[PDB]
Design a protein around this motif. Sequence first.
Motif, PDB file in Angstrom:
ATOM      1  N   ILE A 193     -15.007   6.062  17.214  1.00  0.00           N
ATOM      2  CA  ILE A 193     -13.705   5.842  17.453  1.00  0.00           C
ATOM      3  C   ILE A 193     -12.852   7.118  17.057  1.00  0.00           C
ATOM      4  CG2 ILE A 193     -11.349   4.524  17.575  1.00  0.00           C
ATOM      5  CD1 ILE A 193     -13.445   2.044  16.202  1.00  0.00           C
ATOM      6  N   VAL A 194     -11.946   7.612  17.816  1.00  0.00           N
ATOM      7  CA  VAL A 194     -11.051   8.902  17.385  1.00  0.00           C
ATOM      8  C   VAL A 194      -9.669   8.153  17.448  1.00  0.00           C
ATOM      9  CG1 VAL A 194     -11.902  11.176  17.532  1.00  0.00           C
ATOM     10  CG2 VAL A 194     -11.573   9.852  19.596  1.00  0.00           C
ATOM     11  N   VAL A 195      -8.887   8.557  16.277  1.00  0.00           N
ATOM     12  CA  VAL A 195      -7.421   8.185  16.667  1.00  0.00           C
ATOM     13  C   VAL A 195      -6.702   9.538  15.815  1.00  0.00           C
ATOM     14  CG1 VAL A 195      -7.931   5.740  15.834  1.00  0.00           C
ATOM     15  CG2 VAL A 195      -7.206   7.219  14.105  1.00  0.00           C
ATOM     16  N   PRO A 196      -5.650   9.792  16.377  1.00  0.00           N
ATOM     17  CA  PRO A 196      -4.699  10.844  15.768  1.00  0.00           C
ATOM     18  C   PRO A 196      -3.877  10.100  14.809  1.00  0.00           C
ATOM     19  CG  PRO A 196      -4.156  10.320  18.136  1.00  0.00           C
ATOM     20  CD  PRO A 196      -5.031   9.239  17.768  1.00  0.00           C
ATOM     21  N   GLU A 197      -4.171  10.932  13.569  1.00  0.00           N
ATOM     22  CA  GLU A 197      -3.416  10.353  12.302  1.00  0.00           C
ATOM     23  C   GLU A 197      -2.931  11.869  11.777  1.00  0.00           C
ATOM     24  OE1 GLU A 197      -2.581   7.823  10.414  1.00  0.00           O
ATOM     25  OE2 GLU A 197      -2.670   6.613  11.853  1.00  0.00           O
ATOM     26  N   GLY A 198      -1.603  11.952  11.550  1.00  0.00           N
ATOM     27  CA  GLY A 198      -1.085  13.296  10.765  1.00  0.00           C
ATOM     28  C   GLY A 198      -1.502  13.612   9.474  1.00  0.00           C
ATOM     29  N   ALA A 199      -1.957  12.594   8.740  1.00  0.00           N
ATOM     30  CA  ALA A 199      -2.365  12.859   7.411  1.00  0.00           C
ATOM     31  C   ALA A 199      -1.319  13.583   6.523  1.00  0.00           C
ATOM     32  CB  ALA A 199      -3.701  13.574   7.436  1.00  0.00           C
ATOM     33  N   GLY A 200      -0.080  13.578   6.970  1.00  0.00           N
ATOM     34  CA  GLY A 200       0.883  14.126   6.112  1.00  0.00           C
ATOM     35  C   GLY A 200       1.139  15.792   6.579  1.00  0.00           C
ATOM     36  N   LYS A 201       0.429  16.137   7.315  1.00  0.00           N
ATOM     37  CA  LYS A 201       0.502  17.569   7.554  1.00  0.00           C
ATOM     38  C   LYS A 201       0.690  18.102   9.173  1.00  0.00           C
ATOM     39  CE  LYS A 201      -2.261  19.075   3.474  1.00  0.00           C
ATOM     40  NZ  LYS A 201      -2.853  18.030   3.062  1.00  0.00           N
ATOM     41  N   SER A 202       0.623  16.944   9.992  1.00  0.00           N
ATOM     42  CA  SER A 202       0.794  17.257  11.385  1.00  0.00           C
ATOM     43  C   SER A 202       1.592  16.101  11.777  1.00  0.00           C
ATOM     44  CB  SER A 202      -0.545  17.291  12.181  1.00  0.00           C
ATOM     45  OG  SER A 202      -0.434  17.136  13.469  1.00  0.00           O
ATOM     46  N   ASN A 203       2.627  16.262  12.722  1.00  0.00           N
ATOM     47  CA  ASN A 203       3.295  15.517  13.315  1.00  0.00           C
ATOM     48  C   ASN A 203       2.811  15.021  14.799  1.00  0.00           C
ATOM     49  OD1 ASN A 203       5.024  16.024  10.998  1.00  0.00           O
ATOM     50  ND2 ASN A 203       6.220  17.577  12.333  1.00  0.00           N
TER      51      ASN A 203
ATOM     52  N   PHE B 228     -10.540  11.208  12.273  1.00  0.00           N
ATOM     53  CA  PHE B 228      -9.048  11.271  12.329  1.00  0.00           C
ATOM     54  C   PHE B 228      -8.464  12.718  12.783  1.00  0.00           C
ATOM     55  CE2 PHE B 228     -10.014   7.898   9.111  1.00  0.00           C
ATOM     56  CZ  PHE B 228      -9.137   7.029   9.624  1.00  0.00           C
ATOM     57  N   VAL B 229      -7.813  12.824  13.877  1.00  0.00           N
ATOM     58  CA  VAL B 229      -7.390  13.986  14.356  1.00  0.00           C
ATOM     59  C   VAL B 229      -5.983  14.342  14.100  1.00  0.00           C
ATOM     60  CG1 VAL B 229      -9.552  14.383  15.887  1.00  0.00           C
ATOM     61  CG2 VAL B 229      -7.508  13.460  16.651  1.00  0.00           C
ATOM     62  N   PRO B 230      -5.493  15.673  14.022  1.00  0.00           N
ATOM     63  CA  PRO B 230      -4.131  16.018  13.840  1.00  0.00           C
ATOM     64  C   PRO B 230      -3.189  15.660  14.984  1.00  0.00           C
ATOM     65  CG  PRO B 230      -5.610  17.955  14.078  1.00  0.00           C
ATOM     66  CD  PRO B 230      -6.491  16.565  14.020  1.00  0.00           C
ATOM     67  N   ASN B 231      -3.563  15.516  16.144  1.00  0.00           N
ATOM     68  CA  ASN B 231      -3.145  15.289  17.375  1.00  0.00           C
ATOM     69  C   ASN B 231      -3.725  14.598  18.503  1.00  0.00           C
ATOM     70  OD1 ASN B 231      -3.753  17.542  19.065  1.00  0.00           O
ATOM     71  ND2 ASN B 231      -2.859  18.815  17.375  1.00  0.00           N
ATOM     72  N   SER B 232      -2.948  14.385  19.716  1.00  0.00           N
ATOM     73  CA  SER B 232      -3.598  13.831  20.840  1.00  0.00           C
ATOM     74  C   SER B 232      -4.470  14.863  21.414  1.00  0.00           C
ATOM     75  CB  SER B 232      -2.578  13.465  21.715  1.00  0.00           C
ATOM     76  OG  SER B 232      -1.874  11.953  21.339  1.00  0.00           O
ATOM     77  N   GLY B 233      -4.081  16.163  21.712  1.00  0.00           N
ATOM     78  CA  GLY B 233      -4.775  17.119  22.212  1.00  0.00           C
ATOM     79  C   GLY B 233      -6.363  17.268  21.638  1.00  0.00           C
ATOM     80  N   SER B 234      -6.123  17.315  20.049  1.00  0.00           N
ATOM     81  CA  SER B 234      -7.335  17.470  19.416  1.00  0.00           C
ATOM     82  C   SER B 234      -8.432  16.060  19.740  1.00  0.00           C
ATOM     83  CB  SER B 234      -7.138  17.401  17.986  1.00  0.00           C
ATOM     84  OG  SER B 234      -6.427  18.633  17.645  1.00  0.00           O
ATOM     85  N   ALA B 235      -7.919  15.101  19.801  1.00  0.00           N
ATOM     86  CA  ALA B 235      -8.467  13.703  20.100  1.00  0.00           C
ATOM     87  C   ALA B 235      -9.246  13.758  21.647  1.00  0.00           C
ATOM     88  CB  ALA B 235      -7.996  12.456  20.034  1.00  0.00           C
ATOM     89  N   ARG B 236      -8.609  14.419  22.591  1.00  0.00           N
ATOM     90  CA  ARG B 236      -8.791  14.582  23.846  1.00  0.00           C
ATOM     91  C   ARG B 236     -10.046  15.377  24.239  1.00  0.00           C
ATOM     92  NH1 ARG B 236      -5.977  16.039  29.496  1.00  0.00           N
ATOM     93  NH2 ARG B 236      -7.870  17.350  30.539  1.00  0.00           N
ATOM     94  N   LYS B 237      -9.978  16.554  23.207  1.00  0.00           N
ATOM     95  CA  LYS B 237     -11.169  17.702  23.140  1.00  0.00           C
ATOM     96  C   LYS B 237     -12.195  16.947  22.386  1.00  0.00           C
ATOM     97  CE  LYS B 237     -10.200  20.632  20.164  1.00  0.00           C
ATOM     98  NZ  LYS B 237      -8.869  20.438  20.088  1.00  0.00           N
TER      99      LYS B 237
END
Lengths: 231, 231
Positions: free
Chosen positions: A107-117, A147-156
């Motif tokens: 599973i990939v989920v976008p999670e900001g981890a406090g450094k990405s919105n 856990f990826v910084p944003n939706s674009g990164s998950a899509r990739k």
Amino acid sequence: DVNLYGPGGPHTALKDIANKYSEKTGVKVNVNFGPQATWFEKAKKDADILFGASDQSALAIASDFGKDFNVSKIKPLYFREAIILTQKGNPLKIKGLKDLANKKVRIVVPEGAGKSNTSGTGVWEDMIGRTQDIKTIQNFRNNIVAFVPNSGSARKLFAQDQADAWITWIDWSKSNPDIGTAVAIEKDLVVYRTFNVIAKEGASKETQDFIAYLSSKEAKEIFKKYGWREH
Amino acid sequence: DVNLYGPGGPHTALKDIANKYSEKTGVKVNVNFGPQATWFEKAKKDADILFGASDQSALAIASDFGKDFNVSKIKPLYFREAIILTQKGNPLKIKGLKDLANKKVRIVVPEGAGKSNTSGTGVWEDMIGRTQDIKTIQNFRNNIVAFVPNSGSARKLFAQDQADAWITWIDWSKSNPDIGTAVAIEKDLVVYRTFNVIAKEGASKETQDFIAYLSSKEAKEIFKKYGWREH
């Protein structure tokens, strides 16, 4: 020229809209989209509206602009449900969130981890947590490959077939019917997050008018085309 | 000495657990708590374990420690429900989230805004969003008088009678029964978030031993009395 900045996702509906509005009103509307870092600098020079893919991310993003904007003026206009995107044909026969926890899946989920919105932050734990079973929460988390910084990164990562399932939003699937196979999330677990806008401090009449248009009868149906609802 | 660092909230349960464990084993266990900034520097020196008040915030905080921790090792152990904390006596007769949306009330919520790591991030929108009604979401948001960096900031604002309602966790009420009156959130709307731990890379046998104790019969009952569940 009315300039909009925000994440990929709502930009598809917004493009359809600014283009129709441009036609009928003669006013030119630019829709800039993508990871914050990709547009932040231009946007600091000329942003008229910041649009958002959830509340917590829009609040984060609008705050990055100092007093150019006023975070308290964030306007939620629509919402859409979270979904599971599986690889074409759903080879692992994923039925929902509980199924993800129980099976061997990536599973990939976008999670900001406090450094990405990102609109993803807090979604997966809020959904699977509503099962009220620590074991299921634990099993779900263990299946998270990235856990990826944003939706674009998950899509990739997804398009590279490095994840079997991507926790995302319905509009992403509507906007990109070619990507994967959408699987609906249990009604009792799913979360719905919002589309919003905020006009800059001292926004022009043209700007204001375009914001007003986002609530027009014709804007509603275009948003609706991409899965964005009011009720 | 086994040194833990983490937010206020789970610290109360952990204090009781640590005390009991030292009694049995003779191993000294320190529970350091508070906003991240108040303990971050020391922790970078001696942190054996990081504990969390949600997953997204725990992932954020553990990420801030870089190579010393491996964030894939975050362990969900318990969960508790969000609540509405009203001033003592609940003078405004608040009955839940929909009621907040409808009444003229002042609400405080913790939201990180990408510049603070808090368990509150994404919580209010995920709950009120499940009403699947945009006017409700809009109305609830309009009643929010403050988006604060963390639960401690919200506690202080609330204690100064500057907010009518604070969206928080059952444990904050259990640990502070005189502070206000807890109003249960509608079942179909409420979210449940987790307590978690992560041992530093190369953690001692004693550090690991304490982590194991957190899942003991004894710890379970202490966690239970502050509202942390399994089931």
